Amino acid sequence: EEEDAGLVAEAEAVAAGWMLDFLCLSLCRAFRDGRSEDFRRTRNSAEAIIHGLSSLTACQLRTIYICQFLTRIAAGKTLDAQFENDERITPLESALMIWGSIEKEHDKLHEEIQNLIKIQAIAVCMENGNFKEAEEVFERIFGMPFKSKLLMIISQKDTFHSFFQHFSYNHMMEKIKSYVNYVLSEKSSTFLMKAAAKVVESKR
Amino acid sequence: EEEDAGLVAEAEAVAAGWMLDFLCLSLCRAFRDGRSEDFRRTRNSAEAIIHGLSSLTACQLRTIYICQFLTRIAAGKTLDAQFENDERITPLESALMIWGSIEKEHDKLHEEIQNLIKIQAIAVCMENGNFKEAEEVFERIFGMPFKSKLLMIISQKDTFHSFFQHFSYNHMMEKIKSYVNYVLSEKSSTFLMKAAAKVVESKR
Ligand SMILES: COc1ccc(NC(=O)Nc2ccncc2)cc1
Ligand SMILES: COc1ccc(NC(=O)Nc2ccncc2)cc1
Ligand SMILES: [Ca+2]
Ligand SMILES: [Ca+2]
């Protein structure tokens, strides 16, 4: 009875890990497709499964960081969303912190995404008329040539500057989508998706 | 690409059905063991998975009703919880409505549970000093010999009456736990739990 409860708890922890990987895969696919409502619903399911986790491997921590990173990027223009205990941290700044924590290769795409999030963290403040907040985000991030150009834009209040059109929010989204495609290909072979695909294919 | 998206959506619907059955099984086990916090966390996960459902079979509707029924029973003494659009319906009255809707055998245990929920729906109002609400719950439910005894208790405001000690909240819980044991035995062979148990047993 005591050892049976233990085997039951271990089996629940295995099933939760399979559910976490599947929801991360579904969250990446909805992010890549731009299916906003499916992303919202899947995010809610991933948050609940994470709250119930019995144990955590290094691979599961990376999966959690990936889900949290996409959530913050999706909320990038929602300056009223508070992702940290420090109420001053904006969603794109929270995404930047997670990006610097994930155990992943720092290839050229990694740095391109990092720099696009840095520029957009300032740009989204400027677009809403939050000029003082843009300077505070800049000070927190910066903690150059690129750096001095950004401070000049903030001081001029040049919201629709050509610089933000070349290093745009859409460009940040497209570079993140390229990374998401790699995560999708990697997690497509996880247990629950493979088993579900086999059931579907067998009925075809 | 269009047919690939379709196969992907079908596979996600299969995986969601497997997750729903597993969470119902975990919810039943936590209810049976009296693990209140595990029940709360599992309930949150089941609610999120239900909100994301792509399709629904008669078996999945029964599983949803089972989860909702246990939630209402667990909230039976929380008269501030509103489970219906009509704000007047108490949690045990909401549990009674679901109990009368589930496609299940109406054996002796079914009726014993039904009658215990009816008595306790009044008893929980009386225990909180809600004498007028107890009469309103009685009118909604009733909609005898048992019936006339209850109206007499409500009019006398006899909160700690011997009748409520014989048809007690604990007795209602124990009868519901006997039904939960049957649901647990039936759902123990569902895909995700069977596959997780095999992984655990293989490492022993
Ligand atoms: C970066 O954000 C998060 C990181 C980790 C968790 N959860 C977590 O560590 N849970 C856990 C459960 C049981 N054993 C060990 C660990 C939640 C959020
Ligand atoms: C008794 O409470 C509930 C009953 C059913 C649902 N969901 C539901 O019917 N979803 C669905 C999704 C796609 N195709 C058909 C149906 C939710 C709550
Ligand atoms: Ca704000
Ligand atoms: Ca109330």
UniProtKB/Swiss-Prot annotation, chains A, B:
GO BP term, pick one: cell division
UniProt subcellular location: Nucleus; Cytoplasm, Cytoskeleton, Spindle; Chromosome, Telomere
UniProt KW Metal-binding keyword: no
Annotated function: Binds the telomeric double-stranded 5'-TTAGGG-3' repeat and negatively regulates telomere length. Involved in the regulation of the mitotic spindle. Component of the shelterin complex (telosome) that is involved in the regulation of telomere length and protection. Shelterin associates with arrays of double-stranded 5'-TTAGGG-3' repeats added by telomerase and protects chromosome ends; without its protective activity, telomeres are no longer hidden from the DNA damage surveillance and chromosome ends are inappropriately processed by DNA repair pathways.
Binding partners and assembly: Homodimer; can contain both isoforms. Found in a complex with POT1; TINF2 and TNKS1. Interacts with ATM, TINF2, TNKS1, TNKS2, PINX1, NEK2 and MAPRE1. Component of the shelterin complex (telosome) composed of TERF1, TERF2, TINF2, TERF2IP ACD and POT1. Interacts with RLIM (via N-terminus). Interacts with FBXO4. Interaction with TINF2 protects against interaction with FBXO4 and subsequent polyubiquitination and proteasomal degradation. Interacts with GNL3L; this interaction promotes homodimerization. Interacts with TIN2. Interacts with RTEL1.
Result, substituting S155A: Loss of phosphorylation; induction of mitotic entry and apoptosis and increased radiation hypersensitivity of ataxia-telangiectasia cells
Annotated stretches, region: TRFH mediates dimerization: 1-204
Annotated tissue distribution: Highly expressed and ubiquitous. Isoform Pin2 predominates.
Post-translational modification: Phosphorylated preferentially on Ser-155 in an ATM-dependent manner in response to ionizing DNA damage.
Induction comment from the UniProt entry of this chain: Expression is tightly regulated during the cell cycle; levels are low in G1 and S phase and increase during G2 phase and mitosis.
Positions bearing Phosphoserine: S155
Keyword Zinc: no
Top-level taxonomic group: Eukaryota
Organism: Homo sapiens
MF terms (GO), sorted A to Z: ankyrin repeat binding; DNA binding; DNA binding, bending; double-stranded telomeric DNA binding; G-rich strand telomeric DNA binding; identical protein binding; microtubule binding; protein homodimerization activity
Effect on the protein of changing F31P: Diminishes telomere binding
Keywords in alphabetical order: Acetylation, ADP-ribosylation, Cell cycle, Cell division, Chromosome, Cytoplasm, Cytoskeleton, DNA-binding, Isopeptide bond, Mitosis, Nucleus, Phosphoprotein, Telomere, Ubl conjugation
GO cellular component, one term: spindle
Cross-link (Glycyl lysine isopeptide (Lys-Gly) (interchain with G-Cter in SUMO2)): K149
Protein name from the UniProt record: Telomeric repeat-binding factor 1
Transmembrane segments: none
Comment, domains: The acidic N-terminal domain binds to the ankyrin repeats of TNKS1 and TNKS2. The C-terminal domain binds microtubules. The TRFH dimerization region mediates the interaction with TINF2.
